[PDB]
Structures are given as C-alpha cells and as structure tokens.
C-alpha cells in the first residue's frame, strides 16, 4: 500500500505483520539463553511480547503503527531487527555481571 | 613633554622613532584646565557632585565642605568647592 516511507532509505515493506512476527519471535528466543533473572531478558521480553501482542491483534498497518507507537512500520521493523542484534551481542558481553571495578576514589566529584 | 613627563633624554636611541615623524602630545593638560575653574561656593555643609549630570556624569558622591580650611574636591572631577 504505502507508496514511500518518508525516511529516504527505509523502503516500503509489504507483509509488515509477517516480517515483524518472525523478527519479534526470533528475539523472544535469543533472550531465552540469558540468565534467568537478567534485567535485559526480564525487560526486553516484556517489550517484544507487547509488540508481538499487537502485531497479531491488529491487521491494518496504519492502525498497527499507532499502537506500536513507532514511525512507519518499516521503522518498527528496523528497530525489531536491531534489538535482536543487541540481544545476540548482549549474551556475549554478559552485562548482567557484578561491576567490573569501582571508580578510583574521587573520580566523580566535580567541585574539585 | 607629556603632562606626565615621558620626554626622551637626548641620548635615548628611542628618539629615532620620531625622525621623519613627530610626537603625539596633547596640549590640553588637565592639571591646569581644572585649576582654571571657579571654586564652587555652597551653602550646605555637605554637597553632591554627580559630575554635572545624572547618568551622563560620574558616580554621585557627597563632599564635606565643612572646613573652609579645605575646599572639598570630588575624587572624580577634581572640582574644589568653597563652603
């Protein structure tokens, strides 16, 4: 339908509902290998779920967009695909671990 | 010689500067122009001196012309006031 998503690069994607379901569903999985209680898994699975929840609750694109509160769906996708890449990247950097090293003393006192 | 001296000694090599040239020196010395002014007689013990102006003159200070022995001189205008 939509002739052109405003942004220059993002090109109109037919089957928005489909592309999304796949990207969102893949993500809901990559999060699985994350430690049980890792904020990322706990929060990103809270978001991806709500969007997959609407991606399948509403079949009109323009409508869908308002719900996902993103830009053109061609964007909601661009983002869904990047979170997946962060999710893969996060599972390696293991951000959930305890702090690497506390700041040296007085490394954050501005009126010095 | 400027109102503040500055006259170069004959030997001073710092005199070449003015050769084929001259010396910018103001002929109107304020040491004398202010002396060529009438002591402002007043009735009151103390007097003001806005610098002959409001916002176009100097900050306003009150001078104590209390002793005829001395004519108060506003530190800004150098105007002597004769009680």
């Amino acid at each position: 339908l939509k002739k052109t998503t405003g942004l220059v690069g993002l090109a109109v994607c037919d089957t928005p509902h489909e592309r999304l379901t796949i990207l969102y569903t893949k993500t809901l999985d990559i999060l699985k290998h994350f430690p049980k209680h890792a904020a990322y898994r706990k929060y990103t699975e809270q978001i991806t779920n709500e969007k997959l929840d609407m991606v399948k609750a509403e079949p009109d694109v323009k409508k869908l967009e308002a719900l996902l509160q993103g830009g053109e769906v061609e964007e909601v996708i661009l983002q869904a695909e990047k979170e997946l890449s962060l999710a893969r990247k996060m599972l390696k950097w293991k951000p959930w671990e305890p702090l690497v090293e506390e700041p040296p003393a007085n490394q954050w006192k501005w009126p010095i | 010689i400027t109102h503040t001296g500055q006259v170069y000694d004959e030997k001073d090599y710092r005199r070449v500067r003015f050769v084929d040239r001259q010396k910018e020196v103001n002929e109107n010395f304020a040491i004398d122009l202010i002396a060529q002014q009438p002591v402002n007689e007043v009735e009151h013990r103390i007097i003001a001196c806005d610098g002959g102006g409001g916002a176009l003159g100097h900050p306003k200070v009150y001078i104590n012309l209390d002793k005829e022995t001395k004519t108060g001189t506003c530190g800004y205008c150098g105007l002597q006031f004769k009680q």
Binding site: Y43, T44, Q46, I47, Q69, G70, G71 | -
Partner: protein, 84 residues
C-alpha cells in the same frame, strides 16, 4: 521612480508586481532621532528570589520497563500549505 515603460519592463520581465516591493528604501525607512524613551524598570528579599542558590547538587539514584520519556507525538502536515 522610473519611467513607467522601463518599470513595466521590469514588472513584465520579472512577472511580479515590482513597484510594491522595493529593495530600495525611499520613505519606507524610519527617520533617525527617535524621541527619547523612558524604559520601564517590599518583600523583595534576595533570599526569596535566589536563582543562583535555588539549584542543588545533582541527585544520584514485577517492575515494568520505562522509556526515557513518552514516545514523541508524530507531527502532522501543515494546514495552510501541506506541500510546497
């Protein structure tokens, strides 16, 4: 001030009314020496009106995910001129 023919030359060639919008200031200009102006100036304790001292040192700080702020409302095409 130009011969009407010459100026109709510039109106016809330009395609636009040109006596109206002059790039030269004849009487359009405000004259100088505007009359002098008079610019506009209790419980006025500075301790109540302290912008400088009002600021304080930076604050250092099941659950639901929170965005930095509510998503930006998308703008809408201009009513007067949607496309130019």
């Amino acid at each position: 001030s130009a011969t009407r023919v010459i100026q109709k030359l510039r109106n016809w060639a330009s395609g636009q009314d040109l006596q109206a919008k002059l790039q030269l200031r004849y009487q359009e200009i405000a004259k100088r020496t505007q009359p002098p102006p008079k610019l506009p100036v209790s419980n006025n304790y500075y301790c109540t009106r302290d912008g400088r001292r009002e600021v304080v040192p930076p604050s250092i700080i099941e659950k639901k995910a929170v965005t930095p702020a509510p998503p930006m409302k998308r703008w809408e095409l201009s009513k007067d001129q949607p496309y130019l």
